[PDB]
Amino acid sequence: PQITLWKRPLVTIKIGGQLKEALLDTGADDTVLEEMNLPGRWKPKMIGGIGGFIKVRQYDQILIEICGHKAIGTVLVGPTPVNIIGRNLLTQIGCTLNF
């Protein structure tokens, strides 16, 4: 699908058997999701943005189906304002910017 940017590029994702909505974010190197309960071992980590830094749990090799496209990569879970699909996963589903 081609997505115009006149509205937020929100897509439906399936992660950990749970359905959520996430923002396709080309400005994010990593995928960060709001508080959710994901299976497996995790590692403490710190990530930064415009306002400063948040402490998140790093989950590796996590399957996500983004708009029907499957990808496995690192997912960070913590107090993000919005679910973000980062470039680590966007490259897996073949996302490109066009203008």
Binding site for ligand A1CNI (CB under 6 A): 25, 27-30, 32, 47-50, 80-82, 84, 86
Choose between 17 and 30: whose C-beta lies nearer to ligand A1CNI.
30
Q: Which region, judged by CB under 8 A, interacts with a copy of itself, from 12-20, 37-45, 57-65, 90-98?
A: 90-98
Q: Is 44 in the site for a copy of itself (CB under 8 A)?
A: no
Would you state the structure tokens that stand for residue 94, as one six-digit string?
A: 């073949």
The CA radius of gyration of the chain, in Å to the nearest whole number, is 13
CB 16 within 8 A of CB 36: yes
What does DSSP assign to residue 23?
E
* Annotation says 25 is catalytic: yes
CB 42 within 8 A of CB 58: yes
Instruction: Give the closest residue to 22 by CA, choosing from 69, 72, 66, 83.
Output: 83
Residues in contact with a copy of itself by CB under 8 A are 1-6, 8-9, 23-29, 32, 47-54, 67, 69, 80-82, 84, 87, 90-91, 93-99
